[PDB]
Design a protein around this ligand. Sequence first.
Ligand SMILES: CCCCCCCCCCCCCCCCCC(=O)OC[C@H](COP(=O)(O)OCCN)OC(=O)CCCCCCCCCCCCCCCCC
Ligand SMILES: Nc1nc2c(ncn2[C@H]2C[C@H](O)[C@@H](COP(=O)(O)OP(=O)(O)OP(=O)(O)O)O2)c(=O)[nH]1
Ligand SMILES: [Mg+2]
Lengths: 345, 98, 54, 320, 172, 51, 48, 115, 54
Amino acid sequence: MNPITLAIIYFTIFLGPVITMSSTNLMLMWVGLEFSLLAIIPMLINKKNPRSTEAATKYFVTQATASMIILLAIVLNYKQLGTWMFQQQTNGLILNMTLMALSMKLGLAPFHFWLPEVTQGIPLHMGLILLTWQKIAPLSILIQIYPLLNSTIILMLAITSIFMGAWGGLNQTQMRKIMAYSSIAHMGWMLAILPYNPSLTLLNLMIYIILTAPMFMALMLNNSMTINSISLLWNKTPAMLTMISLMLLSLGGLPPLTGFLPKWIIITELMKNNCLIMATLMAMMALLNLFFYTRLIYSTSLTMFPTNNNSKMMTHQTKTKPNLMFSTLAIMSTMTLPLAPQLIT
Amino acid sequence: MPSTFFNLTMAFSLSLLGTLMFRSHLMSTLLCLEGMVLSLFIMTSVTSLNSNSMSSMPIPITILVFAACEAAVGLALLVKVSNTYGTDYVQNLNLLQC
Amino acid sequence: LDLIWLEKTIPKSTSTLHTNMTTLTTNQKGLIKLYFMSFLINIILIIILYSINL
Amino acid sequence: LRYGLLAAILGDKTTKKLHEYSRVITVDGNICSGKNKLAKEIAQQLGMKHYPEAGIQYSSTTTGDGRPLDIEFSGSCSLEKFYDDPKSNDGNSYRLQSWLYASRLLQYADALEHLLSTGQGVVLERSIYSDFVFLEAMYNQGYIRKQCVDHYNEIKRLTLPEYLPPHAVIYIDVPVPEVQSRIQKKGDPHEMKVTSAYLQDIENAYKKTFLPKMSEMCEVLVYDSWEAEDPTKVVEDIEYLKYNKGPWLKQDDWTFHYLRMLVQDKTEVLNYTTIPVYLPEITIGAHQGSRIYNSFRELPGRKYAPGYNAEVGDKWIWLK
Amino acid sequence: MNNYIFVLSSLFLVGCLGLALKPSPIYGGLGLIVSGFVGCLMVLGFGGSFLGLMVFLIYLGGMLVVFGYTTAMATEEYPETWGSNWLILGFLVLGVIMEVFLICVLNYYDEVGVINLDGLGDWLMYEVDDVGVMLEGGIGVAAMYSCATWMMVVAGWSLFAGIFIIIEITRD
Amino acid sequence: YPSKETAHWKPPPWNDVDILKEKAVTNMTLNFGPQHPAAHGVLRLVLELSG
Amino acid sequence: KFYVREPVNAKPNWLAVGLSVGASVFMWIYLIQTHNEDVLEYKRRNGL
Amino acid sequence: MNLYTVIFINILLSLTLILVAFWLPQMNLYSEKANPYECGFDPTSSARLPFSMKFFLVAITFLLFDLEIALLLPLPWAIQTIKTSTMMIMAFILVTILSLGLAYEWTQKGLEWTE
Amino acid sequence: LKKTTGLVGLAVCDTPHERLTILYTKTLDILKHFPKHAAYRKYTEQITNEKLDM
Ligand SMILES: CCCCCCCCCCCCCCCCCC(=O)OC[C@H](COP(=O)(O)OCCN)OC(=O)CCCCCCCCCCCCCCCCC
Ligand SMILES: Nc1nc2c(ncn2[C@H]2C[C@H](O)[C@@H](COP(=O)(O)OP(=O)(O)OP(=O)(O)O)O2)c(=O)[nH]1
Ligand SMILES: [Mg+2]
């Protein structure tokens, strides 16, 4: 690489969502989305393998099409009302096109097909940057239009994203695809609670981000790609196992881990708004999510898969783990349930 | 003006259908993307000229700048695809399914 | 009962249903032509749902 | 890790610290032909750093106390047992070969780290580019199997192209009867039980594959024994060598920086040697693996990180 | 001379239909050049000429680079124009017939008033300041230099970052 | 969970790189024939060109 | 030396040690002072 | 209307000239006459194969610089503004960052026709 | 001290006495492996010896 273009690209990656979430003009939100996409593409295609090229191409055409639909919605709103924000009396067709295009930006089902494809064939840190940072700007736009959303389309997208994410993560054995389907399921939960409480989708987004940051960090430590690769972790880094298991259980939503809190409070708000059918279906598919997490836990922690001869040399060498980032986020993402009234806002 | 705006919206719809329905050519997909861009530019310019929104007249120039940036990135990715395979075929780039 | 039919009824049948449905869900090829065709079908369904519910 | 992007920005440029003798010189030959002394003398009178041939105990000598560990901590190879009986019921030949490849990979990474960090050239004995000769000799003599060969080739494909080839490859051609006579005169009872077909297999692998495939990317200095057994003509050839081919010419400060990062992180070096391909000659199993790992952690100086071991020193334990 | 803008909009619809129907990218760039010229004429008819000339120049440069790339890599031995498959021509004329059918339906259904046959050409330009200086398009695009400096700086940073982005993508 | 519709798949490579060599660049063959002004009247300079 | 290669941390990084200890002491002092100011302000605003 | 009439008159003039060129002379068409030229030999390829241009990065940079041109072109109306200090600063910044991008590409050998 | 050789592709090649010395000694050492009656050995030894002497 080169430090100058590293600084330019990473600053533009930062600047995109910041402009989107701090700008009150829909045009400036759109140019923030464009900033994020165009800046993150060279970080995706960096290893210059065919898989990286394919992932960059798929991501580019998907996000470009979705952003074009977003800009269509903005221009139609400007035609209808003369302003640059959906105020209160816009067209429901415009709002539904906005929701559909932002769903394809976010990557929730049935627009979810590219997300495991792009997450596969991409290095783990770029998968982390995608699955955490790229989902804040479209969520910021969705939170900005908090009323005047179609709850029917919202709930349909939410339920199909949770269903398809649970099934996909159940099938997959590649770790990056597992993380992508986890992303799809949690985005389904956030979108489900979006029209009733912006605070709860913000809370679920924060819980998901602080939960899947150290999961990706622990994958990044040993460059573990598959279930077998994470299975020979007892020989590589045996101190990782308890935190890995606790974070996987917290992603599953088991009490008393703090990952139970977003699902619990979202179910509470949906009970307050009388959507028991959707809440029950979402909870059962979250149990399916917990099943594929628990199979991962069986592979990596509660059993000891066979190891090979060169792991002796791996034990001979020395390692390095980031301070202030892994352990802090792991503790805050596992043992922060009794601070639930402070976490909800 | 409403007839012309209906025609421009239908032109955007046609270019969106072209973007969604692939025919073996990433370059043709990028062409459909830029057709969508041109339709949006004409819609925004006609709206601003009709409403006399001279303060909002920089909006088409902004969307043109960002659209050319995304077209630039797409052409660079097409160059990388052609270097990888040599044919530039969207069905040929498919190996991330497993 | 306890070694065939309760086992066949609740847990094994639930596992069989969900593994069939996850095979059917994750039976995708990596063709973005097919992915975008599915996205078009999604857009058409959203348009029809809006035009029906209104 | 002291070196990083910040250190490179503040200025630690490899091309700034390069030199006319900042070369990687790899000495190769058959089982017993004068290559340990030749590399020593070449490093001695070129100012390089001599790296002897990476044996079983290379990681043991380069990490920790530096004393060789047990035969179960440092692989399970037993080259003497390989010479005594190949084609054993347990996979010892391929275990020895894969462990030697990983040891040579670690040695090549150490040599590259030394060269990119200090600018001093390095003279290696039989680097990773000349280990497939031993593997192919093992396979063609029937000592290992096609699954082992495929696993080795997969690990070689995963690890080898991420590094740089040697600047110079010196080869010592020597006939198989001469190698046999030198082996018998050495007197090692295990090494005396080597097949002349095996030695001819190593030589054939060398000539057929190693010399052209390295000649297309660096320069080759094939010598005889009489051209060798005189480590001054070789040094004069190295001095008046021309380095006008290979990937050492098309790279710059930032390529050197990323290579230096990848080569100073030793776990990233040895990451692909531990792929979970479950070859029964290589995989171990949970009970033996956990017993060996716990005993290795109970070794002195190995229970914690090397800065933190009160039984061997490390007085300022509570402030770091 | 009243339905001039409607004729232009119909031509733009036809050009976008051809671009959607996806010829060889040589003819795709041709169709986009024609559509860009037609959209320039539409903007010029509706008002200021600067925006139309700008989009014309920009798309001329863009389709030129596109032509170079589809000659370089996005080409084949028999580049289909439109008549390699009769389905493409039949679908083009089917879309034309559907366009005529829909505009006739919307003329017959004159309650909403989106398209009217008798009222076409009557509501093109709504209200204009008859006496007045400096009211044409391009003054606002100049006001991007003084009143929307945020728009100016995000466009400039987009182009700068885009230079860095394309160098790093095609670094190889 | 391999089925009849996905039994032909393979696991991804560990380093996300696989061999996909074609070597089918097909450099353009152009002849400076014996009519070119640059050719000296009588020359068939067959040129393998990369652009 | 027990080790063949010098460990990255054989001596404490005294800059980091002093910075961490000083940051802890400053944060505790600032926390106690702002708690005292908060209880004083609360009592002053609503009586005692 | 005037410019439209002149455009149509020029188009009709060019069409009339090429129609005269096609219907005036005598035609004698056969296969060896209408074969592609290729300097007096049969072409080896089909002249539709990939060409592999060598200035692709320069072409993409041309796209970006053309949009920087589109940004810079409203300057004759921009200099009529009432502020003129923010206008001057903004024009300086725009030209400076365009020049910085060109300088960075030149340093990184982007416009060097990599074969 | 010499700036250029005047022939294209011929490098300047500083300290030429040592290079000529090692080339001539290598030529003599490989001529020692020829038969004593080899006229090529005799004549090439004469040429190399007189050039090394000068
Ligand atoms: C008489 C009383 C009647 C009333 C009570 C009825 C309910 C009783 C309780 C539920 C039944 C028990 C469910 C849990 C046990 C079954 C799951 C199981 O054990 O699956 C194992 C199997 C994987 O086998 P594995 O070990 O990996 O393979 C061999 C080695 N690899 O796993 C698989 O193949 C996939 C397993 C998926 C996970 C199953 C658990 C989650 C179920 C989610 C339910 C969702 C409900 C809504 C569904 C959609 C709407 C219909
Ligand atoms: N099977 C096997 N044996 C190897 C490999 N590398 C080295 N050996 C063995 C060959 C010898 O028995 C022993 C010592 O290697 P050398 O080639 O350095 O022999 P030695 O030091 O006796 O002679 P030298 O003066 O260096 O030529 O190690 C390898 O990759 N596989
Ligand atoms: Mg030796």
